Design a protein around this ligand. Structure first.
Ligand SMILES: O=C(O)CCC(=O)C(=O)O
Ligand SMILES: O=C(O)CCC(=O)C(=O)O
Ligand SMILES: O=C(O)CCC(=O)C(=O)O
Ligand SMILES: O=C(O)CCC(=O)C(=O)O
Ligand SMILES: [Fe+2]
Ligand SMILES: [Fe+2]
Ligand SMILES: [Fe+2]
Ligand SMILES: [Fe+2]
Ligand code: NA
Ligand code: NA
Lengths: 282, 283, 279, 277
């Protein structure tokens, strides 16, 4: 339904992703930006090649066309809004950014400025298709559920409850809103039922039929909508890999009112996972 | 190869467990004790009914025939730090071998349920000899060369220990699996993802019903089990008050083959991403 | 009668019964106990006559005349369960691949070892009730296909995932590992994941009992709301006599969704490995 | 000689500056070298490649399969048509005693996006296992089988095979066609194969190729798996030549086959439906 005829557009896969040719971000016009925004709502992640030398001031202004920018992670000297993604300073797990926060980012703009000629691909997945591919009884179940997303590390403790199925505010289409990295458990199920259901959803939602895989070339820029995607940074390289990122704040994942109360354990109830995880990491 | 003809013995299952009749623990003789010890090495867990009123001094002396007794943070009978009080009001249904997160787990325990319902609260035991012997030869060969880290991290108790995956029983010379769901963390020579897959298989296989027994407690019943070669599981199907008296015999050193490989070495920054979901937050 | 429950979940041993000439009023008490305890055990019934065994089964309904299993000579209704002549170490509910599974059975182990060969049963009411409310609500609206495909026997049937016991009105899970194939309104991969969870949860030790057979003991169980499992831990000869009561018609809610419809050429690729060849 | 653009660290490379139609013996040697290095290579812009040249090219690698519809007068050139697919990781025909050593595939009709093919590096799948597990697998074999109307075949192959040219060891099991490991019981086999299948197709071991008109893919079936993504509805047609003659070879097994007892039954620990679609 969204018309996007200005630039030359090369889709990556049927599910999502498109490379946009004929764009120069440095001095982009308002009209050209509006077209990129429509392409982002259509393709969920878009790639802008050959943008070497993009000035810091233009990079920040571009991000601010989408919303307020986050101030984190190292940042570019003189620009707290430009975050540094440096392999010498890696994320090979499917995730949606910062969903342990009540208001995750709406999206990001990432440019790999130094990297290997091969290795270090990034994958994205289409959470609309992950929801739409579930059968009707399961979609109906998930519409009424919420999940807790959490992180507990030194210096960062956060948790948030979000609908399992969210509407995109600017398309009105429903998308799965759970991810392996940050989702803990479904709130209305007991933990063992939650484990079983999330295990299925994590695998199904990152099926190759729902993903794209991008090979970075120096100067390439990726822009993605964090509301309706997951992504994964492939850890297949030893070379130095360095990226500049701006992160657009302000999502509020919203869906149906939950149709059941939170699961209430009895006093002293213990969670015994059905599947083994080690007690100690590396 | 162990002869045990003195008492009336009623085995529970083919795998393990036997109820011993005609026994009075209160003033047991040395000869009768030697027979009970043989029955324990043969049957792994034995049950002695009708022992209501067993005196504290006699219970302690009985335990001490097996080894040194644990004394400790846990309520105990007045004047007897060795006799622990177990109380449902002060419980987790999970297969475990006692305290394998310690370098020296207990040899075994003697437990008598003194208050409880007529049904509910059964305890199951499993035979870790059969769990190992039931694995095919390539897998037994693999496990013989592996060790595993066992650990616990709770308020006031932090402990870990590395044990052979396959231990020999020092007094029978027979080999037994030595991992359990509750306390084993990971196999040391595998990466964590491989470890998870193998332990998941082993935990399920080792508690197959063909390797277990299930005991219904009656007032006065005493259970004595060998912690070197069993797991056990407390069924959580009751709400009534449940109270027991327990003595714990210290002094195991799980021993097996020298490991055939070095510990797995992760690279700097390497991250463990489990293949199977566990929740981040419990109850 | 003196009634001794086995576990909180189900099962009770009944002393003081003589099945051979049981009165109509004593039978009514056994029936009440069966609805309360789901499986009941009657010890000390050695020598129970064939005619009395058949009359007892017929108090519950029509008895099955099996085609494959041997039967006691002269009595097509008394089936033989013999370890030499054939064991079933898999959780199952009897014949759920049929549109009308049995409503229960009466089994007596007449010869067996002093240990080994226990049978376990599970309580499918508690299996359903132990699910959280969103999942109970989901299952209430689903059905499942149960099937068997062997030489000489080919049968499938569609049953509610949650059935209402006709006498008690209480809801019970009605899927089992051995004979359930898939949930009809989900795709096969979703079905696999949900059934895998249900199978393991439904046979949790908190929902089961385990019975050690003594020669002469009789078990009577309600096949509408139980599963059972025959432990395969013995090599000695084990022989039982069984009568099977026909006539279940599992009933539950109208499904809330249509069957899942694959597209032409769609392929089922299971998420979990099974071997392509058995033994 | 050529301009070589690798797809991922693990495997795959696109080769520019090639013309297959009249390729010289020396340029073919370079393609062969690149195939041993990159496991699957992609040759764009080969529209119009003649049937006689396509057959001669395949015959440089070995004998060609002559069994599917095919081009008029050329039973070696198989026609693959979506309208006449299953998304599953597989190595071709491993249910046969001598699976193909590789294939040459050109998509001639297809959509601009959709229908990618992924390949995985079975050397890295093996090498990424820890030493105790590599040691175990070295001594095992597996049965591969297929049972469909008109085709029943099974074969036993080493779980770890030595590539005859490179001498490097590669995993040799795949989800589609491997049944079970022969020296384990079936439940142990399921658990180990489940782990191996998922590990071996990790994204760090794979590449994903987007087909363009005229593109030719050449892959070594001895040390790869591949997967056809099922994300399209448009018509998709390819021309394929299959090179026969693998004999997967590895270590003598260190244990005998597992022997069940009479009457023993296999009860899988994980649910599969009894009926497909
Ligand atoms: O390094 C990458 O490709 C992506 C990193 C990432 O997860 C992010 O920028 O949010
Ligand atoms: O309470 C029981 O039945 C067993 C408790 C237990 O795990 C123990 O005493 O070590
Ligand atoms: O042999 C047993 O204990 C039970 C066998 C069985 O499944 C039956 O009788 O339906
Ligand atoms: O169509 C494809 O991309 C792959 C088909 C395939 O599996 C083969 O040609 O062997
Ligand atoms: Fe990210
Ligand atoms: Fe314990
Ligand atoms: Fe049965
Ligand atoms: Fe193929
Ligand atoms: Na469970
Ligand atoms: Na893995």
């Amino acid at each position: 339904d969204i018309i996007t005829t200005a630039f030359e557009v090369r889709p990556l896969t049927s599910a999502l992703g498109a490379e946009i040719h004929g764009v120069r971000l440095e001095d982009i016009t308002d009209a050209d930006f509006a077209e990129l925004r429509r392409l982002l709502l259509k393709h969920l992640v878009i790639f802008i090649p050959d943008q070497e030398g993009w000035s810091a001031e233009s990079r920040i202004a571009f991000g601010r066309r989408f919303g307020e920018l986050e101030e984190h992670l190292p940042h570019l000297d003189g620009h707290p809004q430009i975050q540094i993604i440096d392999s010498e300073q890696k994320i090979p797990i499917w995730h949606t950014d910062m969903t342990y926060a009540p208001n995750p980012p709406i999206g990001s703009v990432l440019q790999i400025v130094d990297g290997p000629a091969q290795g270090g691909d990034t994958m994205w997945s289409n959470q609309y298709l992950a929801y739409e591919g579930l059968s009707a009884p399961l979609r109906d179940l998930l519409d009424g559920l919420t999940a807790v997303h959490s992180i507990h590390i030194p210096g960062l403790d956060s948790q948030a409850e979000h609908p399992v199925v969210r509407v995109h505010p600017e398309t009105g289409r429903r998308a799965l809103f759970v991810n392996r990295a940050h989702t803990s458990h479904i709130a209305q199920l007991n933990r063992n039922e939650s484990d079983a259901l999330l295990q299925y959803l994590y695998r199904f939602s990152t099926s190759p039929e729902f993903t794209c895989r991008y090979q970075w070339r120096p100067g390439s820029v990726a822009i993605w909508d964090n509301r309706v995607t997951q992504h994964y940074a492939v850890d297949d390289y030893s070379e130095h890999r360095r990226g500049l990122r701006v992160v657009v704040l302000g999502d509020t994942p919203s869906g149906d009112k939950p149709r059941w109360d939170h699961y209430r354990p009895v006093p002293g109830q213990r969670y015994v996972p059905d599947w083994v995880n080690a007690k100690e990491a590396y």
